[PDB]
Amino acid sequence: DIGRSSVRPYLEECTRRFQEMFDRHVVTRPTKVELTDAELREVIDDCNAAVAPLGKTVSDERWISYVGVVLWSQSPRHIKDMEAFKAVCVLNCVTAVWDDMDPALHDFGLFLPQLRKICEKYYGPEDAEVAYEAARAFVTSDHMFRDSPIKAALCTTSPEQYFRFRVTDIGVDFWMKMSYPIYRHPEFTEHAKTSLAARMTTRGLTIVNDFYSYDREVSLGQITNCFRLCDVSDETAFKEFFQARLDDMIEDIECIKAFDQLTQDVFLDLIYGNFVWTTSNKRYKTAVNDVNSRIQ
Amino acid sequence: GRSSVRPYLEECTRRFQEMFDRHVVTRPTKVELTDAELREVIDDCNAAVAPLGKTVSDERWISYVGVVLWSQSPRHIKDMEAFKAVCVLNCVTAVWDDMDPALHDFGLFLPQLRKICEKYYGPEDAEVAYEAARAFVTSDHMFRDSPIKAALCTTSPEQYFRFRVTDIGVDFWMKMSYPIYRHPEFTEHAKTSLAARMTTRGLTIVNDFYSYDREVSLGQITNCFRLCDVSDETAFKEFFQARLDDMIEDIECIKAFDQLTQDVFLDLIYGNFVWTTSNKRYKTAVNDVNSRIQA
Ligand SMILES: [Cl-]
Ligand SMILES: [Cl-]
Ligand SMILES: [Mg+2]
Ligand SMILES: [Mg+2]
Ligand SMILES: [Mg+2]
Ligand SMILES: [Mg+2]
Ligand SMILES: [Mg+2]
Ligand SMILES: [Mg+2]
Numbered sequence: 001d002i003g004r005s006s007v008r009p010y011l012e013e014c015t016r017r018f019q020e021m022f023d024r025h026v027v028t029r030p031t032k033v034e035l036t037d038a039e040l041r042e043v044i045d046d047c048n049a050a051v052a053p054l055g056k057t058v059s060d061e062r063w064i065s066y067v068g069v070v071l072w073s074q075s076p077r078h079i080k081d082m083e084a085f086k087a088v089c090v091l092n093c094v095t096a097v098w099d100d101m102d103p104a105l106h107d108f109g110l111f112l113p114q115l116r117k118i119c120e121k122y123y124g125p126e127d128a129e130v131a132y133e134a135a136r137a138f139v140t141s142d143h144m145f146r147d148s149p150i151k152a153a154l155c156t157t158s159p160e161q162y163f164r165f166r167v168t169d170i171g172v173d174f175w176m177k178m179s180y181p182i183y184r185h186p187e188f189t190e191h192a193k194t195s196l197a198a199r200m201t202t203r204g205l206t207i208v209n210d211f212y213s214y215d216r217e218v219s220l221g222q223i224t225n226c227f228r229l230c231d232v233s234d235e236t237a238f239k240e241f242f243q244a245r246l247d248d249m250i251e252d253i254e255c256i257k258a259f260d261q262l263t264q265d266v267f268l269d270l271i272y273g274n275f276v277w278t279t280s281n282k283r284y285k286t287a288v289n290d291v292n293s294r295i296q
Numbered sequence: 297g298r299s300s301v302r303p304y305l306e307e308c309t310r311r312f313q314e315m316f317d318r319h320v321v322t323r324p325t326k327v328e329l330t331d332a333e334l335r336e337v338i339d340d341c342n343a344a345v346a347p348l349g350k351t352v353s354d355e356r357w358i359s360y361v362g363v364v365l366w367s368q369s370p371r372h373i374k375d376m377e378a379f380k381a382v383c384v385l386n387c388v389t390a391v392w393d394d395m396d397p398a399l400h401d402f403g404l405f406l407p408q409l410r411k412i413c414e415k416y417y418g419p420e421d422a423e424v425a426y427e428a429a430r431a432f433v434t435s436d437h438m439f440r441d442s443p444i445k446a447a448l449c450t451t452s453p454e455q456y457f458r459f460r461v462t463d464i465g466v467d468f469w470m471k472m473s474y475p476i477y478r479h480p481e482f483t484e485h486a487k488t489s490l491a492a493r494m495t496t497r498g499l500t501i502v503n504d505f506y507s508y509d510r511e512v513s514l515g516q517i518t519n520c521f522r523l524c525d526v527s528d529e530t531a532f533k534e535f536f537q538a539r540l541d542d543m544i545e546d547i548e549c550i551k552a553f554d555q556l557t558q559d560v561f562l563d564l565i566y567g568n569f570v571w572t573t574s575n576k577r578y579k580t581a582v583n584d585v586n587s588r589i590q591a
Contacts, residue, residue, distance in 0.1 A: 137487055149552045153549050157549055161549050164490070187438075194431050194435055194462040251451065255451055
């Protein structure tokens with residue numbers, strides 16, 4: 001019940017502890033990519049050009065709120081392909097719309113060609129297929145698991161089962177497989193394609209997202225959130241659960257430091273940058289305001 | 297003696313089997329190949345690894361291929377050409393897994409993997425199977441003397457099994473096996489790698505226990521039982537129970553999948569155990585079936 005329906009009492013302390021953790025384990029700050037107004041407008045118009053078959057209009061402010069994760073969580077010091085950057089901007093945004101849509105509106109025949117059109121505009125032939133398959137797999141997974149028994153089992157059993165589901169469902173495998181062309185770094189490209197890149201970063205992305213999206217998701221009956229494993233109405237059990245998740249994040253980050261310099265740079269900018277964006281998006285500042293729910 | 301799980305061999309085998317009978321229930325069935333299929337498979341295996349210069353005996357091929365014969369899901373098979381492809385791809389990449397890396401020639405071996413995939417698979421599936429084979433052999437190579445491998449295999453069971461999702465080859469297996477079944481739900485789980493992540497621990501814990509002696513004699517660190525002091529019967533006992541607990545949890549969550557997919561997942565884990573307990577490979581440290589000869 002409502003005594004369990006929000007993580008608001010822990011908002012300030014957990015935000016502080018998240019930042020404390022990154023300052024002591026990552027150290028290097030994330031950094032915005034600033035697109036021009038023309039580049040931002042190109043991205044947005046391509047976004048509108050992808051969801052228009054599905055019928056709905058999406059405001060500039062909604063697009064800008066979706067695209068911030070790409071602006072904050074890539075690795076600017078290592079970028080070599082700004083066309084691949086813009087592709088990740090568009091692909092991220094249009095599949096976030098899909099993630100927010102009611103499944104009865106998931107028209108694959110109309111939407112999948114639009115995803116391919118994006119990948120072919122921005123990527124070479126081989127990259128286009130890799131980016132497109134991951135986009136296809138991501139939107140199919142989100143459709144697949146709406147009120148699936150599989151999701152219920154994997155989210156309610158253990159943190160191990162839940163994070164295993166999230167390697168795909170949170171979109172990080174997709175992210176890696178559309179982002180390696182930005183960097184054109186051979187080791188990073190191989191970790192992206194084995195999905196080791198996604199598995200190394202899944203928990204740090206997921207735990208942060210789950211904390212700040214918890215209120216919205218429970219109000220909408222969405223079960224894919226690790227803090228639904230613990231009783232968030234008891235401070236003691238919550239704090240103990242939360243420390244376990246910080247420990248998870250720390251172990252991952254320290255193992256990431258065994259990767260080569262450029263690769264760990266990208267991995268860590270992703271995790272820390274997602275945190276910075278997540279704490280500045282109004283999507284995650286009520287259960288249900290007008291920038292995150294709508295309609296069903 | 298410190299690198300051997302020999303004192304634990306009988307009890308752990310019994311406990312493994314008891315676990316499967318209780319939690320899986322239905323046993324695996326071994327695929328019978330005719331003489332012509334088996335000779336087609338071995339001929340293509342030899343043709344594929346010939347440019348790497350190391351002869352491989354029929355007996356060695358048969359030892360590699362048994363895992364495919366035992367760990368697929370016979371009552372759901374629809375495409376025996378894809379089945380034969382998995383036989384060949386499994387065996388040739390197992391030889392690669394047993395090669396000194398100085399003999400890894402990607403320029404000679406990668407086109408042999410492509411030629412196998414194009415023979416047995418439709419056009420999309422040949423790409424999916426080829427990429428996963430490429431991913432597997434490249435990973436085995438690039439992690440051979442690697443601080444990344446050291447970190448993931450020494451830190452925690454959690455980091456270890458994360459590396460094994462790729463390293464043991466199960467993601468490869470799923471991406472080349474889905475065409476055998478033509479089951480739409482199974483094909484998607486294969487392509488997201490959820491299939492692989494559900495089955496990794498049950499495959500890895502079994503294989504690790506029985507390949508431990510061989511691996512530590514060859515200086516191979518990719519084995520979860522190197523996380524515990526196998527010379528401490530109390531510490532080993534507690535560790536082994538924790539790994540059984542991991543297998544049980546995975547298996548009970550697999551049962552939430554649709555009936556066919558769950559048959560394929562559980563046949564894979566249990567069939568692998570049945571094959572492993574009768575593979576000669578695992579019966580010495582290094583024997584001249586599974587020798588990767590060196591130095
Ligand atoms: Cl959900
Ligand atoms: Cl190894
Ligand atoms: Mg989602
Ligand atoms: Mg969502
Ligand atoms: Mg969320
Ligand atoms: Mg190996
Ligand atoms: Mg091996
Ligand atoms: Mg082994």
